[PDB]
Tab-separated table of C-alpha atoms and ligand atoms in Angstrom:
chain	number	residue	atom	x	y	z
Z	1	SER	CA	0.000	0.000	0.000
Z	2	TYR	CA	1.276	3.475	-0.919
Z	3	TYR	CA	0.038	7.057	-0.671
Z	4	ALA	CA	-0.760	9.025	-3.821
Z	5	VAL	CA	0.822	12.478	-3.444
Z	6	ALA	CA	1.005	15.600	-5.633
Z	7	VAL	CA	4.509	17.002	-5.602
Z	8	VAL	CA	5.407	20.624	-6.447
Z	9	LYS	CA	8.502	22.851	-6.370
Z	10	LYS	CA	8.744	25.329	-3.501
Z	11	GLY	CA	8.241	28.891	-4.781
Z	12	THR	CA	5.357	28.190	-6.999
Z	13	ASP	CA	2.208	29.238	-5.140
Z	14	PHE	CA	-0.627	27.448	-6.910
Z	15	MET	CA	-2.917	25.313	-4.753
Z	16	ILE	CA	-5.287	22.448	-5.576
Z	17	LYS	CA	-8.062	24.778	-6.714
Z	18	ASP	CA	-5.527	26.396	-9.024
Z	19	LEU	CA	-4.521	23.442	-11.203
Z	20	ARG	CA	-6.413	24.265	-14.429
Z	21	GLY	CA	-4.074	25.193	-17.279
Z	22	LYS	CA	-0.990	24.011	-15.417
Z	23	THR	CA	1.251	21.347	-16.954
Z	24	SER	CA	1.421	17.923	-15.308
Z	25	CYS	CA	3.550	14.771	-15.039
Z	26	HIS	CA	1.978	11.305	-14.599
Z	27	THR	CA	3.645	7.879	-14.184
Z	28	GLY	CA	1.454	6.605	-16.968
Z	29	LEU	CA	-2.070	6.005	-18.288
Z	30	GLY	CA	-4.135	3.887	-15.882
Z	31	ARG	CA	-1.723	3.621	-12.944
Z	32	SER	CA	-2.875	4.355	-9.417
Z	33	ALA	CA	-1.052	7.437	-8.146
Z	34	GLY	CA	-0.760	8.224	-11.767
Z	35	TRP	CA	-4.027	8.652	-13.742
Z	36	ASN	CA	-6.614	6.946	-11.478
Z	37	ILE	CA	-6.528	8.822	-8.183
Z	38	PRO	CA	-5.745	12.427	-9.125
Z	39	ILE	CA	-7.943	12.334	-12.235
Z	40	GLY	CA	-10.926	10.859	-10.363
Z	41	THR	CA	-10.406	13.269	-7.459
Z	42	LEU	CA	-10.293	16.190	-9.902
Z	43	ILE	CA	-13.464	14.826	-11.552
Z	44	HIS	CA	-15.319	14.581	-8.253
Z	45	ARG	CA	-14.614	18.005	-6.841
Z	46	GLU	CA	-15.900	18.899	-10.310
Z	47	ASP	CA	-12.687	20.433	-11.652
Z	48	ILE	CA	-12.658	18.115	-14.658
Z	49	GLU	CA	-16.138	18.003	-16.222
Z	50	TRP	CA	-16.399	14.717	-18.157
Z	51	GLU	CA	-16.087	15.953	-21.742
Z	52	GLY	CA	-17.108	13.173	-24.125
Z	53	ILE	CA	-20.344	11.355	-24.921
Z	54	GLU	CA	-19.633	10.096	-28.349
Z	55	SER	CA	-17.270	8.308	-26.329
Z	56	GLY	CA	-16.405	8.522	-22.664
Z	57	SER	CA	-13.265	10.546	-23.359
Z	58	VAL	CA	-11.451	10.734	-20.046
Z	59	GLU	CA	-8.288	11.557	-22.014
Z	60	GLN	CA	-10.083	14.412	-23.760
Z	61	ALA	CA	-11.619	16.008	-20.662
Z	62	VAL	CA	-8.127	15.977	-19.131
Z	63	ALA	CA	-6.433	17.477	-22.208
Z	64	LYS	CA	-9.116	20.170	-21.974
Z	65	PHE	CA	-8.055	20.764	-18.398
Z	66	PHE	CA	-4.286	21.005	-18.316
Z	67	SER	CA	-2.364	22.879	-20.993
Z	68	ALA	CA	0.095	20.051	-21.656
Z	69	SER	CA	0.971	16.765	-19.927
Z	70	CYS	CA	3.281	13.819	-20.089
Z	71	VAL	CA	1.155	10.665	-19.748
Z	72	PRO	CA	3.082	7.683	-21.124
Z	73	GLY	CA	0.568	5.170	-22.506
Z	74	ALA	CA	-1.921	7.778	-23.758
Z	75	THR	CA	-3.790	6.699	-26.898
Z	76	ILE	CA	-5.945	9.479	-28.313
Z	77	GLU	CA	-4.846	12.891	-27.082
Z	78	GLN	CA	-1.581	14.266	-28.428
Z	79	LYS	CA	-1.682	17.015	-25.831
Z	80	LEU	CA	-1.104	14.284	-23.223
Z	81	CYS	CA	2.292	13.510	-24.779
Z	82	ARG	CA	3.539	17.029	-25.258
Z	83	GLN	CA	5.859	17.485	-22.270
Z	84	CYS	CA	7.430	14.013	-22.645
Z	85	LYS	CA	11.210	13.800	-23.048
Z	86	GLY	CA	12.637	11.520	-25.732
Z	87	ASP	CA	12.232	10.790	-29.451
Z	88	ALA	CA	9.313	11.377	-31.804
Z	89	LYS	CA	8.091	7.803	-31.901
Z	90	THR	CA	9.116	6.670	-28.430
Z	91	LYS	CA	8.548	9.452	-25.928
Z	92	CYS	CA	4.975	8.638	-24.876
Z	93	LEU	CA	5.288	4.839	-24.773
Z	94	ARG	CA	4.276	3.177	-21.463
Z	95	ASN	CA	8.013	2.851	-20.825
Z	96	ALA	CA	10.026	5.911	-21.878
Z	97	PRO	CA	12.268	8.498	-20.174
Z	98	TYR	CA	9.353	10.060	-18.291
Z	99	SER	CA	7.444	6.863	-17.509
Z	100	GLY	CA	6.935	5.559	-13.988
Z	101	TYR	CA	7.516	7.027	-10.516
Z	102	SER	CA	11.124	8.098	-11.141
Z	103	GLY	CA	10.249	9.546	-14.562
Z	104	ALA	CA	7.128	11.468	-13.508
Z	105	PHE	CA	9.296	13.205	-10.909
Z	106	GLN	CA	12.179	13.824	-13.337
Z	107	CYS	CA	9.545	15.496	-15.541
Z	108	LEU	CA	8.867	17.980	-12.713
Z	109	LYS	CA	12.558	18.363	-11.735
Z	110	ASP	CA	13.463	18.987	-15.387
Z	111	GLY	CA	10.903	21.808	-15.406
Z	112	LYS	CA	8.707	19.843	-17.813
Z	113	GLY	CA	5.734	19.860	-15.434
Z	114	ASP	CA	4.248	22.072	-12.692
Z	115	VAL	CA	3.083	19.011	-10.756
Z	116	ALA	CA	3.969	15.308	-10.635
Z	117	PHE	CA	1.383	12.725	-9.569
Z	118	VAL	CA	3.410	10.151	-7.644
Z	119	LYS	CA	3.773	8.233	-4.395
Z	120	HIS	CA	4.947	9.149	-0.925
Z	121	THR	CA	8.474	7.732	-1.255
Z	122	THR	CA	9.342	9.212	-4.635
Z	123	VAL	CA	11.268	12.353	-3.677
Z	124	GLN	CA	13.351	10.755	-0.919
Z	125	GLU	CA	14.056	7.709	-3.087
Z	126	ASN	CA	15.050	9.807	-6.083
Z	127	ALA	CA	16.515	12.989	-4.619
Z	128	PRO	CA	17.139	12.752	-0.875
Z	129	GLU	CA	19.511	15.713	-1.042
Z	130	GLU	CA	16.885	18.025	-2.521
Z	131	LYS	CA	13.736	17.220	-0.527
Z	132	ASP	CA	13.475	20.744	0.885
Z	133	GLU	CA	13.238	21.981	-2.706
Z	134	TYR	CA	9.778	20.445	-2.863
Z	135	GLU	CA	6.423	20.257	-1.161
Z	136	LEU	CA	3.099	18.536	-1.487
Z	137	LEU	CA	-0.403	19.684	-2.619
Z	138	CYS	CA	-2.999	18.804	0.050
Z	139	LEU	CA	-6.703	18.215	-0.688
Z	140	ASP	CA	-7.650	20.992	1.761
Z	141	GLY	CA	-5.945	23.673	-0.350
Z	142	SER	CA	-2.708	23.921	1.619
Z	143	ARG	CA	0.836	22.696	1.109
Z	144	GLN	CA	2.876	20.502	3.409
Z	145	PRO	CA	6.522	19.470	3.150
Z	146	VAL	CA	7.471	16.170	1.592
Z	147	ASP	CA	7.615	14.234	4.866
Z	148	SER	CA	4.032	15.173	5.771
Z	149	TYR	CA	2.395	12.848	3.264
Z	150	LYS	CA	0.428	10.989	5.952
Z	151	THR	CA	-1.256	14.342	6.554
Z	152	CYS	CA	-1.167	15.461	2.906
Z	153	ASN	CA	-2.204	12.878	0.292
Z	154	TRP	CA	-4.787	12.309	-2.455
Z	155	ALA	CA	-5.396	8.715	-1.281
Z	156	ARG	CA	-4.051	5.497	0.273
Z	157	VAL	CA	-3.556	2.893	-2.451
Z	158	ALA	CA	-4.002	-0.883	-2.081
Z	159	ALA	CA	-0.965	-3.125	-2.563
R	1	LIG	FE1	1.490	2.428	-8.491
């Protein structure tokens, strides 16, 4: 079991209400801290209105919602692939430089994203020497520092 956390650089000042039109980094299409929890959360405080109905387009309603994302694994929406590092043909594959926990966070570190949707051990695991350079978006419209994820997380995820 992990916690889903939303990780941001210190010195940006956007809160959870303020996410529309930001850029984002996800581990990949369909993963738990990655597409599932933040996108469903955003859908249920009504930030992402489900744009589709020729077609349940979740990918569309999300592309409508952030400016540009990296979401390795994305099928339909070429906005979702727009911040991804790598080659033309490769960069948005389900494994690619920006795929996964480590890659979602490297997206944000690299400046390629304003937020990374990840898990509670990602910043320590990947950059223990730069943890104070980050904080976490809480659901209550505050920030807390990276250690505070028990008190600052989008959800607790099963095994
Ligand atoms: Fe996961």
